[PDB]
Write a protein that binds this ligand. Structure first.
Ligand code: H83
Ligand code: H83
Length: 326
């Protein structure tokens, strides 16, 4: 069968902690008052959620209310426990309350308000420095949650809120987040298609925090190259082919050989043969002002098939690409 794997960092953080920290099914939820909050407007719509801007009428402070379609109670408890565990961590969205609607029998999470600036207008005003600045803020969030034994598993631009006026960044939507336990086999149906790590696509279940580092690499490539998304798969199988068109098929076979992975038969007629591309091939007139040798070197160390060969969040923070940031 497949060769086992474990995280190179924070491997045993949950092993050395008591069950109260990671056994989310045993966590006791305590509701606040739904009457403290007045809904203002709809911000977005998720698979099993609706996000609203609200006002806490007891202090006249704006908040964010995430109403959850309670399709799986276990999943709601997981998200609540993780949010409670990470509360106060750098650039982590702050869970301020948990409320219930008794008539519809619906739970809601109340968060600190983040004034998100428009992402489409944020493009082409962003400089090389801004990308390095905001990439560093995301790394602080990831190094923190990984150090807390938690994998986000849904890193993408939709899950990163930026208040550009105050240079404030928050990593949000911890609904797919999970406790890392060495040796555990996780569900590969996590992250959004374009941000899915090769481990998920080849059905390698013993993954870790390094999955978030791949997703972060997809975001960096799309920002510096002005190509959204960077890896444009039309399905989960085609997503690996899009990756293989860049990283090449040679290294892909080295990765599946190292972990003794069996490729799904669906990859037989679509994978083909692809040479390893130079990152400099993606440089064009519209993006060259955001690209540098240090950005390319950093990108090359995140976008690796081998999850163990990717920079951890702390190693990434020490990369020359971030020498210009505080
Ligand atoms: N006269 C009472 C004024 C406050 C009314 N409360 C508004 C309110 C009602 C329900 C909810 C709610 C909706 C879905 C799930 C969980 C909670 C909220 Cl956030 C707010
Ligand atoms: N679901 C709420 C919508 C949030 C939109 N996110 C805006 C955003 C803007 C820029 C970025 C960004 C900045 C620097 C480097 C890479 C990415 C992100 Cl992650 C996110």
């Amino acid at each position: 069968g497949p060769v086992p794997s474990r995280a190179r960092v924070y491997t045993d953080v949950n092993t050395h902690r008591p069950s109260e920290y990671w056994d989310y099914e045993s966590h006791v939820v305590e509701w606040g008052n739904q009457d403290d909050y007045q809904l203002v407007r709809k911000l977005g719509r998720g698979k099993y959620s609706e996000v609203f801007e609200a006002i806490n009428i007891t202090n006249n402070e704006k908040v964010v209310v995430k109403i959850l379609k309670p399709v799986k109670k276990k999943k709601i408890k997981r998200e609540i426990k993780i949010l409670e565990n990470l509360r106060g961590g750098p650039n982590i969205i702050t869970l301020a309350d948990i409320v219930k609607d008794p008539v519809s029998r619906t739970p809601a999470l109340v968060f600190e308000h983040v004034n998100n600036t428009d992402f489409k207008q944020l493009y082409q005003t962003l400089t090389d420095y801004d990308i390095r600045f905001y990439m560093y803020e995301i790394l602080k969030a990831l190094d923190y949650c990984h150090s807390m034994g938690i994998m986000h598993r849904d890193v993408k631009p939709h899950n990163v809120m930026i208040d550009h006026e105050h240079r404030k960044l928050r990593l949000i939507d911890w609904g797919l987040a999970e406790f890392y336990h060495p040796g555990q086999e996780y569900n590969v149906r996590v992250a959004s298609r374009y941000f899915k790590g090769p481990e998920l696509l080849v059905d390698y279940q013993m993954y870790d925090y390094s999955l978030d580092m791949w997703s972060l690499g997809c975001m960096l490539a799309s920002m510096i190259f002005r190509k959204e998304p960077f890896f444009h798969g039309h399905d989960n199988y085609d997503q690996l082919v899009r990756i293989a068109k860049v990283l090449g098929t040679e290294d892909l076979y080295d990765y599946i050989d190292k972990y003794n992975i069996e490729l799904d038969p669906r990859f037989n007629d679509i994978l083909g043969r692809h040479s390893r591309k130079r990152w400099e091939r993606f440089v064009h007139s519209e993006n060259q002002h955001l690209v540098s040798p240090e950005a390319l070197d950093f990108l090359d160390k995140l976008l690796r098939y081998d999850h163990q060969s990717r920079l951890t969040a702390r190693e990434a923070m020490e990369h020359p690409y971030f020498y210009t940031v505080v």
